[PDB]
Amino acid sequence: ARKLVIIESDLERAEERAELSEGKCAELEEELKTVTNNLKSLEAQAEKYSQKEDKYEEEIKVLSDKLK
Amino acid sequence: CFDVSTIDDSGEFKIIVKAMETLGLKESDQNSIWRILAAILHIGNITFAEAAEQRTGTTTVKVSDTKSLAAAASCLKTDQQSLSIALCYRSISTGVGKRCEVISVPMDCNQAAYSR
Amino acid sequence: DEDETTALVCDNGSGLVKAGFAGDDAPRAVFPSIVGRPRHQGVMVGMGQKDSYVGDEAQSKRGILTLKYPIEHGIITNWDDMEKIWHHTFYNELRVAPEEHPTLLTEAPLNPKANREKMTQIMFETFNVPAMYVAIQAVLSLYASGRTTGIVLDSGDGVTHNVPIYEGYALPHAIMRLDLAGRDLTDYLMKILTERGYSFVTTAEREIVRDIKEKLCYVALDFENEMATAASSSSLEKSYELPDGQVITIGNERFRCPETLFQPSFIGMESAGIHETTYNSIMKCDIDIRKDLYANNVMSGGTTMYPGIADRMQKEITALAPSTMKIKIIAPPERKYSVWIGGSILASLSTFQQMWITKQEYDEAGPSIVHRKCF
Numbered sequence: 235a236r237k238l239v240i241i242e243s244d245l246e247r248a249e250e251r252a253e254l255s256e257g258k259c260a261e262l263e264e265e266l267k268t269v270t271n272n273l274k275s276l277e278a279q280a281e282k283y284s285q286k287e288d289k290y291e292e293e294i295k296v297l298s299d300k301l302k
Numbered sequence: 303c304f305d306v307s308t309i310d311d312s313g314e315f316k317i318i319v320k321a322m323e324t325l326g327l328k329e330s331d332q333n334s335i336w337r338i339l340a341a342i343l344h345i346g347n348i349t350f351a352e353a354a355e356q357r358t359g360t361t362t363v364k365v366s367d368t369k370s371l372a373a374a375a376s377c378l379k380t381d382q383q384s385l386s387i388a389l390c391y392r393s394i395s396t397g398v399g400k401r402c403e404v405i406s407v408p409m410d411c412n413q414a415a416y417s418r
Numbered sequence: 419d420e421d422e423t424t425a426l427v428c429d430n431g432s433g434l435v436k437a438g439f440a441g442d443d444a445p446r447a448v449f450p451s452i453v454g455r456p457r458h459q460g461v462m463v464g465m466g467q468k469d470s471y472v473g474d475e476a477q478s479k480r481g482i483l484t485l486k487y488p489i490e491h492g493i494i495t496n497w498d499d500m501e502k503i504w505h506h507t508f509y510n511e512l513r514v515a516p517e518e519h520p521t522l523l524t525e526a527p528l529n530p531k532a533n534r535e536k537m538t539q540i541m542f543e544t545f546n547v548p549a550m551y552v553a554i555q556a557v558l559s560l561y562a563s564g565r566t567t568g569i570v571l572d573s574g575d576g577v578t579h580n581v582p583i584y585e586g587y588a589l590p591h592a593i594m595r596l597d598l599a600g601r602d603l604t605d606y607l608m609k610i611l612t613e614r615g616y617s618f619v620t621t622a623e624r625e626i627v628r629d630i631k632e633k634l635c636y637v638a639l640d641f642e643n644e645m646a647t648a649a650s651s652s653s654l655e656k657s658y659e660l661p662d663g664q665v666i667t668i669g670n671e672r673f674r675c676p677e678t679l680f681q682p683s684f685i686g687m688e689s690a691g692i693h694e695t696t697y698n699s700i701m702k703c704d705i706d707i708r709k710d711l712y713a714n715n716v717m718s719g720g721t722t723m724y725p726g727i728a729d730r731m732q733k734e735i736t737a738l739a740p741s742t743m744k745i746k747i748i749a750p751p752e753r754k755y756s757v758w759i760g761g762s763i764l765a766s767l768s769t770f771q772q773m774w775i776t777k778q779e780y781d782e783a784g785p786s787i788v789h790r791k792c793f
């Protein structure tokens with residue numbers, strides 16, 4: 235009867251840490267998808283900013299020549 | 303200069319093969335070694351051009367002839383870009399544990415051709 | 419190692435103790451120059467506390483420690499505690515005996531005369547050093563970056579120094595010293611933090627202020643235009659989960675404190691900004707020697723790592739400076755270790771022999787040997 239309590243109590247500990255872990259893991263998994271999307275989005279913008287400032291580099295150069 | 307009248311090119315190759323085979327370097331092994339040498343040739347043929355990254359007169363290094371630097375990473379089969387992030391740019395951290403590579407320094411031309 | 423014999427490189431400041439083995443390009447074991455005791459009386463029995471808690475062991479556990487810093491920019495509050503800082507350097511991390519390999523330390527420009535003789539007493543008489551020199555902070559970095567003709571402004575947490583070294587050191591003054599860096603920014607935060615229900619009270623957690631600072635805090639390009647932007651809660655506040663557990667939405671807090679750098683009027687000092695003092699040093703030199711100084715400006719130190727540090731200089735300088743030639747500032751993307759890279763240089767030079775102090779040289783010219791040969 236006592237041994238039953240020991241194992242039954244472990245079941246409560248196991249069930250508790252299981253639902254808690256899965257609950258946060260699911261929340262984390264969903265969050266990663268949002269962060270990953272933000273990464274892809276920001277990376278895309280950075281690419282547009284990089285190619286733009288580079289276009290100004292060749293633009294400011296040719297203008298400097300015409301000015302000279 | 304490449305073609306020379308004195309020395310015969312096609313005639314020597316077959317003699318080199320004999321020398322390798324006579325010692326202990328079969329064609330199977332030869333090919334396995336040529337890949338290593340051919341890899342270096344790809345990482346060799348890359349004298350990067352002027353990189354208009356700076357503002358005034360100085361400059362850094364950047365690839366214009368990509369297919370050449372791509373060949374260097376081709377045999378390596380790695381992200382062509384990431385490769386140049388750690389080489390042309392010098393990364394250093396260290397302290398406590400031991401180093402963490404990512405943040406780096408676009409070095410000048412002299413140190414650029416130096417590492418090259 | 420069947421190469422040479424007796425060689426090493428070192429460098430200390432108000433942040434990290436940069437040091438390594440013989441003939442190295444980069445440091446090997448950097449650690450915070452801290453040291454404290456126990457405000458908690460360390461389980462007195464779970465060891466006779468002692469060892470103030472210096473080194474990684476100290477930085478690991480801050481709570482028990484009452485981090486009382488010894489060398490605040492120039493002044494050494496106490497030398498007795500310095501004894502067991504170098505006892506941790508050469509013996510624990512470096513794993514080499516100081517009674518063999520030379521040592522290359524750094525010199526805080528214009529350091530009290532009485533200090534030099536005191537230091538030498540700790541090395542020669544106690545740690546027995548038959549060869550060592552204490553080079554002057556800035557000049558070292560000059561030869562590393564590959565510059566012979568530029569103006570250096572090397573400073574991190576210690577003291578600000580405007581060293582116009584492009585063709586000669588030790589000559590007219592044209593140099594300045596300002597106790598406004600690092601720890602000044604580390605202590606000022608807790609003050610203004612009070613208005614946001616935050617207060618890093620004691621010194622132990624004060625050290626963390628610096629940790630978070632160097633990962634987000636940036637400098638405002640123009641405070642006026644960014645004042646109205648405050649309404650737009652997007653570029654300001656950013657969720658920073660404190661390791662323990664207490665979010666801090668730093669936003670306007672990021673570009674408010676750094677403003678003190680260019681405006682020392684926020685802490686009761688008439689000291690002019692780092693771009694005014696620059697003029698003060700340039701106006702002393704000849705008239706036909708400025709056009710080349712503006713061409714290249716050596717901005718080094720960990721203080722020159724924050725966002726918006728170089729671009730701001732090119733805005734304020736051009737105003738009260740000649741406007742004809744081109745002006746470019748050389749700020750090595752990693753300009754903190756500029757001193758160490760330069761340290762590696764002088765560490766491998768043989769001409770350096772006509773600089774350091776030999777064991778016998780000290781006894782032949784008394785304690786004044788330092789200021790009798792060096793300068």
Ligand SMILES: Nc1ncnc2c1ncn2[C@@H]1O[C@H](COP(=O)(O)OP(=O)(O)O)[C@@H](O)[C@H]1O
Pocket residue numbers: 430431432433434573574575576577600628631632633719720721723724754
């Ligand atoms: N990338 C960085 N960004 C911001 N701060 C940095 C960076 N790298 C180093 N630091 C800081 O710079 C300081 C060390 O700079 P340093 O010039 O060596 O100082 P000192 O010479 O006064 O000892 C430390 O506070 C460190 O945290």
Ligand SMILES: [Ca+2]
Pocket residue numbers: 430431432524526555576577
């Ligand atoms: Ca210093």
